[PDB]
Swiss-Prot record:
Function: Acts directly on vascular smooth muscle as a potent vasoconstrictor, affects cardiac contractility and heart rate through its action on the sympathetic nervous system, and alters renal sodium and water absorption through its ability to stimulate the zona glomerulosa cells of the adrenal cortex to synthesize and secrete aldosterone. Acts by binding to angiotensin receptors AGTR1 and AGTR2. Also binds the DEAR/FBXW7-AS1 receptor.
Organism expressing this protein natively: Homo sapiens (Human)
Residues with PTM Beta-decarboxylated aspartate: D1
Superkingdom of the source species: Eukaryota
Coiled coil (residue ranges): none
Part of the full-length chain shown: 25 to 32 of 476
Record-given protein name: Angiotensin-2
Amino acid sequence: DRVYIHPF
């Protein structure tokens, strides 16, 4: 799932 990660 690390195609679109927004940790913000």
